[PDB]
């Protein structure tokens, strides 16, 4: 984990997100993947690594 | 509507992760927006958009 700095304020839109403020120092726990926000048929939401998602396109 | 499914099983490792089963229907909240996991000085963790932090 590295220390990073928030560029902008961000207001979390779901409980799995973090509220941050511009210029806040944070610890970066994982930048090795692009996580995507997903929801299933059971109405549950969360994050999965992008490569686990298939868009039929 | 673009159909989106789980490509593979993904077994969640942390509370903010979602377990998904291969071939199940999913819905994407964003257009290929990447998120990273961070922690604040009060030890709270969560995801933020990757482009919001500077390394």
């Amino acid at each position: 984990e590295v220390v990073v700095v928030a560029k902008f304020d961000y207001v979390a839109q779901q409980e799995q997100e973090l509220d941050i403020k511009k210029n806040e120092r944070l610890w970066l726990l994982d930048d090795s993947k692009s996580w995507w926000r997903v929801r299933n048929s059971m109405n549950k939401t969360g994050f999965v690594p992008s490569n686990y998602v298939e868009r039929k396109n």
Side-chain angles (χ1 to χ4, degrees), chain A:
Chain A
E1 314 169 359
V2 298
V3 171
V4 294
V5 178
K7 298 182 202 168
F8 314 114
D9 296 344
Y10 183 71
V11 174
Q13 304 291 287
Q14 14 145 39
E15 276 171 357
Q16 304 103 314
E17 295 167 30
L18 193 68
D19 296 315
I20 68 182
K21 291 182 193 201
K22 174 185 276 302
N23 293 316
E24 188 172 355
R25 277 56 178 168
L26 304 160
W27 288 259
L28 176 61
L29 306 189
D30 194 14
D31 63 357
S32 66
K33 289 167 181 65
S34 297
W35 299 78
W36 286 355
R37 295 205 294 174
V38 297
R39 171 173 177 161
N40 64 27
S41 310
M42 274 315 312
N43 305 308
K44 203 190 163 192
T45 199
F47 290 85
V48 302
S50 61
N51 63 301
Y52 288 80
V53 181
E54 184 167 69
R55 307 183 197 217
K56 302 243 197 203
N57 69 183

